[PDB]
Amino acid sequence: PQITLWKRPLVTVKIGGQLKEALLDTGADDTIFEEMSLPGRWKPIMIGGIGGFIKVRQYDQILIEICGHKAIGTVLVGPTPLNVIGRNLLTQIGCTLNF
Amino acid sequence: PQITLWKRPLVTVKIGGQLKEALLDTGADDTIFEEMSLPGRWKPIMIGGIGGFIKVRQYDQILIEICGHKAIGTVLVGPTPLNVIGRNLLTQIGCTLNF
Ligand SMILES: CCC[C@@]1(CCc2ccccc2)CC(O)=C([C@H](CC)c2cccc(NS(=O)(=O)c3ccc(C(F)(F)F)cn3)c2)C(=O)O1
Numbered sequence: 001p002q003i004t005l006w007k008r009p010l011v012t013v014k015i016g017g018q019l020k021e022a023l024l025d026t027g028a029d030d031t032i033f034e035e036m037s038l039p040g041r042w043k044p045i046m047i048g049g050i051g052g053f054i055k056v057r058q059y060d061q062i063l064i065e066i067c068g069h070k071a072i073g074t075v076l077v078g079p080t081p082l083n084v085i086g087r088n089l090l091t092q093i094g095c096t097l098n099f
Numbered sequence: 100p101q102i103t104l105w106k107r108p109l110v111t112v113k114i115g116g117q118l119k120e121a122l123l124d125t126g127a128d129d130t131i132f133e134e135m136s137l138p139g140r141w142k143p144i145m146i147g148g149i150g151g152f153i154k155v156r157q158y159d160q161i162l163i164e165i166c167g168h169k170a171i172g173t174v175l176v177g178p179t180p181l182n183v184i185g186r187n188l189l190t191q192i193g194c195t196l197n198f
Pocket residue numbers: 023025026027028029030031032047048049050051081082084086107122124126127128129131146147148149150180181183
């Protein structure tokens with residue numbers, strides 16, 4: 001679709017068999033979800049943004065679907081204030097910024 | 100322009116007659132810049148990032164040229180990993196998300 005930015009660009013995403021609301025964030029290098037269960041192996045890492053750093057669990061090769069678009073990539077899990085879809089996954093659904 | 104997301108959406112901006120780099124960030128409600136001088140009076144604001152909360156200084160009606168487009172709006176100044184253009188100015192330059 002074409003999404004205006006008058007409000008936060010929140011979308012429904014299918015991940016780990018659940019439906020969840022997530023923010024489309026062009027400034028995020030990576031994708032971070034609040035605490036949730038995901039399959040497979042993970043490692044602890046540290047990511048930073050406004051307000052500093054948080055420790056998160058890195059899961060690789062995770063399937064996502066955003067508005068009918070399927071993708072696969074790394075998904076992080078930890079104490080983010082909300083679920084955020086970052087560029088590693090926005091590219092895969094063919095998301096661009098236009099003006 | 101159409102900006103893809105394989106790299107960080109960093110653009111050159113002109114603020115206070117100076118050239119600076121800033122991130123185009125649809126995940127940010129607001130625009131925040133690293134410590135700098137801006138004209139006029141300021142008000143106190145607290146904002147959340149993925150790392151937690153920071154206190155910032157809020158300046159109104161600040162002229163900023165973003166990738167050659169003029170915007171005049173609210174600019175926050177505080178401790179940030181980098182300069183961030185949020186939705187308040189992304190909307191002024193006519194930016195949408197497309198996929
Ligand atoms: C001005 C605050 C902006 C924002 C708001 C989050 C929010 C939204 C609604 C409610 C509450 C909070 C969105 C955002 O993109 C980031 C940063 C990038 C600037 C962010 C987001 C997601 C992940 C990261 N970590 S990272 O390792 O993937 C990373 C590290 C650095 C950068 C860099 F480009 F900013 F340097 C981008 N990404 C950072 C953030 O920390 O908070």
